[PDB]
Design an enzyme around this catalytic site. Structure first.
Site, short mmCIF file in Angstrom:
data_model
loop_
_atom_site.label_atom_id
_atom_site.label_comp_id
_atom_site.label_asym_id
_atom_site.label_seq_id
_atom_site.Cartn_x
_atom_site.Cartn_y
_atom_site.Cartn_z
N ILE A 55 0.87 -1.16 0.00
CA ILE A 55 0.00 0.00 0.00
C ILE A 55 0.93 1.24 0.00
O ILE A 55 1.91 1.26 0.75
CB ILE A 55 -0.90 -0.05 1.28
N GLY A 56 0.61 2.23 -0.82
CA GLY A 56 1.31 3.51 -0.89
C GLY A 56 2.73 3.52 -1.44
O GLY A 56 3.58 4.28 -0.94
N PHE A 116 5.01 4.25 3.00
CA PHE A 116 4.56 4.00 4.36
C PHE A 116 5.29 2.80 4.97
O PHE A 116 4.93 2.34 6.04
CB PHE A 116 3.02 3.83 4.39
N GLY A 117 6.35 2.35 4.31
CA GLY A 117 7.13 1.20 4.74
C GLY A 117 6.46 -0.12 4.37
O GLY A 117 5.71 -0.19 3.39
N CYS A 118 6.73 -1.16 5.17
CA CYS A 118 6.26 -2.54 5.01
C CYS A 118 4.79 -2.67 5.43
O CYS A 118 4.50 -3.23 6.50
CB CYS A 118 7.15 -3.49 5.80
N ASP A 122 3.23 14.53 17.14
CA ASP A 122 3.59 14.70 15.72
C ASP A 122 2.36 14.97 14.83
O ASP A 122 2.20 14.35 13.77
CB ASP A 122 4.44 13.51 15.21
N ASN A 155 0.12 13.27 8.73
CA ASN A 155 -0.14 12.24 9.72
C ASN A 155 -1.62 11.97 10.01
O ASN A 155 -1.92 11.30 10.98
CB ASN A 155 0.64 12.55 10.97
N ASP A 200 -0.64 8.05 12.80
CA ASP A 200 0.74 8.18 13.24
C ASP A 200 0.91 8.22 14.78
O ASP A 200 1.68 9.02 15.29
CB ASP A 200 1.43 9.38 12.55
C1 LIG Z 1 -1.25 4.31 7.97
C2 LIG Z 1 -2.37 3.54 7.34
C3 LIG Z 1 -3.24 2.69 7.96
N1 LIG Z 1 -4.13 2.18 7.05
C4 LIG Z 1 -3.84 2.70 5.82
N2 LIG Z 1 -4.49 2.42 4.69
C5 LIG Z 1 -4.02 3.05 3.60
C6 LIG Z 1 -2.93 3.92 3.59
C7 LIG Z 1 -2.48 4.59 2.34
C8 LIG Z 1 -1.38 5.41 2.24
N3 LIG Z 1 -1.27 5.85 0.96
C9 LIG Z 1 -2.29 5.34 0.19
C10 LIG Z 1 -3.08 4.54 1.03
C11 LIG Z 1 -4.21 3.96 0.22
N4 LIG Z 1 -3.98 4.50 -1.10
C12 LIG Z 1 -2.86 5.32 -1.18
O1 LIG Z 1 -2.48 5.88 -2.20
C13 LIG Z 1 -2.28 4.18 4.80
C14 LIG Z 1 -2.74 3.55 5.96
#
Ligand SMILES: Cc1c[nH]c2ncc(-c3c[nH]c4c3CNC4=O)cc12
Length: 274
Positions: free
Chosen positions: A28-29, A33-35, A148, A153, A166
């Site tokens: 995802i992303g 957003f890492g792993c 933060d 976030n 976050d």
């Molecule tokens: C932190 C987090 C928890 N649940 C999530 N679900 C989705 C995303 C997310 C970040 N970027 C994008 C998404 C979905 N489509 C995108 O382009 C982040 C989180």
């Protein structure tokens, strides 16, 4: 090897592997957003729930596992319509522990408002600010200090509901000196009143549709700049009463800043005029 009474205490947060399908082949992303992977969670009735699954690669030893169980127990008690919930945690036989989060269709709030394709109204932007204020009001009521808060976030679901994210097991999805209160820059300590300061900056990001704050000021020079009484200027399409709310958030005296309940009261009244 884990303590049995702690294992019993975390049971209500534990998602069994037969309840969850993780797709370790689709992130995802774009890795930003890492792993974090697409997943499907099966609730008690067998309803398929689209979720975001984070693999906690930082956990190795049994001591780290034990502290992780606690973080899960703590964040599972934290739920509100404008706060990112914890669906649960996975304790795998082979592989890193997993964090299960609701899927946020429209990603982070900063990228959403910055996107040329989206045209949110002044009212829609004020509405996002009010939702963040509602989420922070809930956090502050539980004596939880975010530390933060920024538009980067906060997340946006399929219904365009803003979720304060976050924090807890949802942190490190990859110092924020231009969002920090003057006293946090001087003492390295954070309070709910320093979160109010960060909320003020977040409202400015909302009304400027994601512009970076103080673009001409170095992170080192921020302290002196704030000590002179300079503050972010009024965005072009920002209502005057809402700019007064932003200015209140950046009062040099923490005790003088509005509470998150006051911010909810004041912003809902502004939203309701549109
Ligand atoms: C932190 C987090 C928890 N649940 C999530 N679900 C989705 C995303 C997310 C970040 N970027 C994008 C998404 C979905 N489509 C995108 O382009 C982040 C989180």
């Amino acid at each position: 090897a884990l303590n049995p009474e702690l294992v019993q205490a975390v049971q209500h947060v534990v998602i069994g592997p037969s309840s969850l399908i993780v797709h370790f082949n689709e992130v995802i992303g774009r890795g930003h957003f890492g792993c974090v992977y697409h997943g499907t969670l099966l609730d008690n009735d067998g309803k398929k729930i689209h979720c975001a699954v984070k693999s906690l690669n930082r956990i190795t030893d049994i001591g780290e596992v034990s502290q992780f169980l606690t973080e899960g127990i703590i964040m599972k008690d934290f739920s509100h319509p404008n706060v990112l919930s914890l669906l649960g945690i996975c304790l795998r036989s082979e592989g890193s522990p997993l964090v299960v989060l609701p899927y946020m269709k429209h990603g982070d709030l900063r990228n959403f408002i910055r996107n040329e394709t989206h045209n949110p109204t002044v009212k829609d932007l004020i509405g996002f600010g009010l939702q963040v204020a509602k989420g922070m009001k809930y956090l502050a009521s539980k004596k939880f200090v975010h530390r933060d808060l920024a538009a980067r976030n906060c997340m946006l679901d399929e219904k365009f509901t803003v979720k304060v994210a976050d924090f807890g097991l949802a942190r490190d999805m990859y110092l924020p000196v231009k969002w920090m209160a003057l006293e946090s820059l001087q003492t390295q300590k954070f309070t709910t009143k320093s979160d109010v300061w960060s909320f003020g900056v977040l409202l400015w990001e909302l009304m400027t549709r994601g512009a970076p704050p103080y673009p001409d000021v170095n992170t080192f020079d921020i302290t002196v700049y704030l000590l002179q009484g300079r503050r972010l200027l009024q965005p072009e399409y920002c209502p005057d009463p809402l700019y007064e709310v932003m200015l209140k958030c950046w009062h040099p005296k923490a005790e003088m800043r509005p509470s998150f309940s006051e911010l909810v009261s004041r912003i809902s009244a502004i939203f309701s005029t549109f």
